[PDB]
């Protein structure tokens, strides 16, 4: 496992669509969602950004290449850290983007060490999301900026969907899942000043069934990486999300001080 569910080589993030008429490729939608978080992180070249829960490293590399920032990405998954470092080295950005171990609930950085923090589909992994947000506030310089993307629960689910929601949370490591208002309350309680909050559930949910389709199509080649059961839970995770409409998606921007 439970503590490690949803992390590793299969840790793929969602994408942004303009309704069910967009027909963009999954990669295009994924880049589009990334660019929306970049728009909410007002840092410039040579500023230093902490990527909390780096996935397999792709948004951090896009972020460094677009804004010219230095990026330190962290995760508890050694697999994710190795994949991400190899991607950075292959892209010739290892001098600008690096990945190392850290638990977001106990960040190994001194106070006020970052100009910005980036958390894309990662804070739901924290059993104590508030402690993680307080750690983010601590390592941000005064005036430092924060850009979050995460799942939110939009309201109660049908009784018939309680089982599906439980499986989505168990298999994806969704240890913290709240509504938008509670999320904003924790951001304030952590000492951060919210600057914007956006429910983009309608743009992102279309990517759920599309990502399920992409992973099932990859079964033959992905089995060595995930294993039989690992591949099963990964495909199930996106299928469950696509069947429970109360699994939403939100963007949050905040600043310290
Ligand atoms: Mg994930």
User: End-to-end span in angstroms?
Assistant: 39 Å
- Side by side, the strands of the main sheet go 3-2-1-4-5-7-6
Bound molecules: magnesium ion
What's the structural domain tally? 1
The tally of beta strands, per DSSP, is: 7
Please state the structural category: alpha/beta
> Can you summarize the main beta sheet?
7 strands, mixed
Q: Please give the count of helices.
A: 10
Order of helices and strands: HEHEHEEHEHHEHHHHE
Helical percent range?
40-55%
Oligomer: monomer
Computed over alpha carbons, the radius of gyration is: 17 Å
InterPro entries: Erg6_SMT_methyltransf, MeTfrase_dom, Methyltransf_11, SAM-dependent_MTases_sf
Binding site for S-adenosyl-L-homocysteine: 12-13, 55, 75, 103-104
Keywords: Metal-binding, Methyltransferase, S-adenosyl-L-methionine, Transferase
Protein name: D-glucose O-methyltransferase
Describe the protein in words.
- The protein contains 10 helices and 7 strands.
- It has 257 residues and is an alpha/beta fold.
- α1 (26-39) packs across α2 and α8 (206-217) runs antiparallel to α10.
- The protein has one domain (1-257).
- α3 links the parallel β2 (70-75) and β3.
- The chain binds magnesium ion (MG).
- Magnesium ion (MG) binds at residues 6, 11, 13, 121.
- The PDB classes it as transferase.
- The entry lists the keywords methyltransferase, natural products, SAM.
